[PDB]
């Protein structure tokens, strides 16, 4: 009935303070082609829209992301996942992303705007050295033209 709609931590102070500061900055100064904010009452659960970067095979696509913070933020990275289906060697069928700053390169200096810029950069420059879909990372290296035809077809079919 009465539900706190968030995490039972002992210290929500550091996380919530930093999250409201990030919310305000990203509404003032959103990254190019990107948007992000809380879904509802829980400032630890955001939603993001990303347009496929111009010049990329994802161009004209509209991609939605789920962003979940924990009470350890900014010392632990947020969890970020595509909801839109996407054809990309570093993003798996459930939208899990293989990006350095979302695991071992995370730094308290990084903000959620930066995560979105990097995600945009990862869309225009896949990282086949750390693949999350083997056939797609393989096709990206051996048959690039077929990889682009598929990423374009998937953008048109799933991201509109």
């Amino acid at each position: 009935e009465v539900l706190f709609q968030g995490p039972n931590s002992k210290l929500l102070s550091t996380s919530a303070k930093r999250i409201q500061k990030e919310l305000a900055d990203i509404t003032l100064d959103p990254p190019p082609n990107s948007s992000a904010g809380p879904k509802g009452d829980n400032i630890y659960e955001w939603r993001s829209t990303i347009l496929g970067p111009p010049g990329s095979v994802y161009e004209g696509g509209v991609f939605f992301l789920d962003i979940t913070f924990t009470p350890e933020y900014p010392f632990k990275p947020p969890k970020v996942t595509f909801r839109t289906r996407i054809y990309h060697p570093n993003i798996n069928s459930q939208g899990v992303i293989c990006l350095d700053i979302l695991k071992d390169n995370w730094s308290p200096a990084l903000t959620i705007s930066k995560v979105l810029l990097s995600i945009s950069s990862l869309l225009t420059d896949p990282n086949p050295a750390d693949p999350l879909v083997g056939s797609i990372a393989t096709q990206y290296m051996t048959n690039r033209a077929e990889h682009d035809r598929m990423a374009r077809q998937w953008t048109k079919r799933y991201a509109t």
């Binding site: 570093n90 798996n92 999350l132 083997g134």
Partner: peptide, 6 residues
Amino acid sequence: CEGYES
């Protein structure tokens, strides 16, 4: 990364 798929 966790979540690898062929």
